[PDB]
From a paper:
Crystals belong to space group P41212 and contain three protein chains per asymmetric unit. The major domain of the enzyme features a Rossmann-type α/β fold accommodating the cofactor at the bottom of a large solvent-filled cavity, which is further delimited by an all-β cap domain inserted between strand β5 and helix αE of the Rossmann domain, as well as an N-terminal extension completing the walls of the cavity. Overall, the structure of SgMT closely resembles that of the related C-methyltransferase PsmD from Streptomyces griseofuscus. The similarity of SgMT and PsmD extends to their quaternary structure, which is established via two cap domains associating face-to-face at a right angle. While two out of three chains in the SgMT asymmetric unit form a non-crystallographic dimer, the third one engages in an analogous interaction with a symmetry-equivalent copy. While its overall structure is reminiscent of the closed form observed for PsmD, the terminal portions deviate significantly between both enzymes in both sequence and conformation. Still, the Ω-loop formed by residues 2–14 of PsmD can be considered functionally analogous to the short, extended segment 7–9 of SgMT; while the side chain of M2, together with a bent conformer of R86, shields the SAH adenine moiety from solvent in PsmD, this function is accomplished in SgMT by the arginine (R81) assuming a straight conformation. Similarly, the three tyrosine residues covering the cofactor, Y11 (Y16 in PsmD), Y18 (Y23), Y126 (Y129), are conserved between the two enzymes and occupy very similar positions. Since this is also true for H220 (H218) and D218 (E216), these data suggest that SgMT features an equivalent catalytic triad (and hence most likely a similar mechanistic paradigm) as proposed for PsmD. In the SgMT crystal structure, the D218 side chain forms a hydrogen bond with N13 in the lid region, i.e., it points away from H220, while in PsmD, which lacks the competing hydrogen bonding partner in the lid, E216 and H218 were consistently found in contact as long as the cofactor was present. Overall, these results are consistent with the notion that a proton relay system akin to PsmD,15 favouring nucleophilic activation of the substrate by the catalytic tyrosine, is also functional in methyltransferases StspM1 and SgMT. Yet, since the actual substrate (cWW)—despite its inclusion in the crystallisation sample—was not detectable in the electron density, its interaction with the protein was investigated in silico (see below).
In the present study, the pyrroloindole motif in tryptophan-based diketopiperazines (DKPs) is synthesized using the SAM-dependent methyltransferase SgMT from Streptomyces griseoviridis. Analysis of the gene cluster and the CDPS indicates that ll-cWW 4a is a potential substrate for the C3-indole methyltransferase SgMT, leading to the formation of the pyrroloindole product 5.
Numbering used by the authors:
A (entry chain B): 8 to 270
B (entry chain A): 7 to 271
Amino acid sequence: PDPYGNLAESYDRLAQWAIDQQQESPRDRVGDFLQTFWQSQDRPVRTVLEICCGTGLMLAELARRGYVVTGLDRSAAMLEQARARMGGKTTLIRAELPDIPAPAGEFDAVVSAAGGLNYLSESQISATFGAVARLLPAGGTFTFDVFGQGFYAKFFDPSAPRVMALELDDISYIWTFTKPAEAPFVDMSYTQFSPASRAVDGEPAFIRTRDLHRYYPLPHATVLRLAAEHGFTDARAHDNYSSDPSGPHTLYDTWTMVRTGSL
Amino acid sequence: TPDPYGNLAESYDRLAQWAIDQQQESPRDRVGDFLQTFWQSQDRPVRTVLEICCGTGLMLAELARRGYVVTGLDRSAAMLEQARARMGGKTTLIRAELPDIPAPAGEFDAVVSAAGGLNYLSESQISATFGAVARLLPAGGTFTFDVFGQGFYAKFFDPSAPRVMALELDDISYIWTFTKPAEAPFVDMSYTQFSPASRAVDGEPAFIRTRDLHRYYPLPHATVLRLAAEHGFTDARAHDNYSSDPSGPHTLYDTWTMVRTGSLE
Ligand SMILES: Nc1ncnc2c1ncn2[C@@H]1O[C@H](CSCC[C@H](N)C(=O)O)[C@@H](O)[C@H]1O
Ligand SMILES: Nc1ncnc2c1ncn2[C@@H]1O[C@H](CSCC[C@H](N)C(=O)O)[C@@H](O)[C@H]1O
Ligand SMILES: [Cl-]
């Protein structure tokens, strides 16, 4: 049940390709957006938890800017990469959201960059909003991105190819996007062909793996309700870590919100 | 002379059927219907038919089913062996690369080329092929073929960037990359194919990868009309994919028919 287990060793190269070819934000741009957002807030930010930290690309960006960072992810394979990047001092928590085994009065901000929250059902993200609210003091903030309208329009029909593929550094990926009838999720299947350890007779060989990435579309009305229900205010959406508004073409919606003084 | 169908021949028939079932390619009996109706409209009867670029013989088998006496020509030994299995020993199969057609004058009543073999010919090679076909046909015989239409290039080729598509079919996986090299008279469709290996690697099934370039030469309508006029044909007409519909900007496969004149070629 870890779709990133087979992806972890090539994830960083694929993330760079997605920046180069699928308009994903480089983590330094995410860092610029976060610092501009936090600088506009009254309460200073020193400690940051990134949930769904993956291989730690965003952790490293924030640490380079002087933040004291902690990461959380469910994937041991991804966290092994994050440990190699960050070294031994960085706290890395292996847990599956909505579980956040960490105490209140500790984090000034929580972030989730590059779409980990797309993997959570509505009830799982609701409980995650609650867990984040318990960790943040009044005036702390929560920032994350999820797929926008333009993503579902572009990769989940119409007129679009249902199968996509990429050949990158001797690995090959074949992606299939399916929308089950009457389901609250959409499915992206990763077929991956990777060079094998040895050869078959006199030919190079490849191992095939198949992994399902199940995504839950998150309407704006749902985000706003979840924010209100869990002690957040001033929820705003922007297009992909820019100052532009969310709109019909947005591929990645960036949400920011502020913890109230509620309990 | 590379043979891009060498690695494809084993799985070609399954892929061709997928393209009919899913990509609007004409079922071979629709091609047969179209040919029989077109030939029936001509004064000169048709019994003997040469299919150039016959591949694995899917169109040979359809024309034989309808009662024609068919001969096939293809450059790919791998494809032709499949045609030999399909047709048996009675059918003449010629291994030759167009424009070479080593067959006698006064032999064929019609020449056909179904499912896109002529897309692989440069304008010079297709001009020479028109000449060779003209020499094989008596006055009143006909030549029918299909090439990619305007809608095919618009759908699969982007002038600005490569396009990538894929298919997983019966444990074979294809990755297709479509490019338009600058200033070239061709466009490129690369086939990466993953097929099951002969043995396993440790405890995991293994796959072999092949890569083969399919190089296609767009053939504008004005060029077909010119080639027909230059090589002894008349009444050149285009239809959409072996139907009675006209060729149009959305057509994926342009079906051309033309009639041999009395000129000496
Ligand atoms: N319910 C869940 N709990 C914890 N981690 C989850 C999760 N669902 C998805 N993930 C993690 O979400 C990550 C998405 S990849 C994003 C990695 C990183 N934030 C970056 O900027 O590159 C994966 O590592 C995946 O394991
Ligand atoms: N210059 C050339 N000379 C001969 N055959 C050629 C050729 N260029 C391409 N071909 C052949 O064109 C074929 C295209 S596939 C079409 C197969 C068949 N007509 C059918 O209806 O399914 C391949 O078998 C390929 O080897
Ligand atoms: Cl961008």
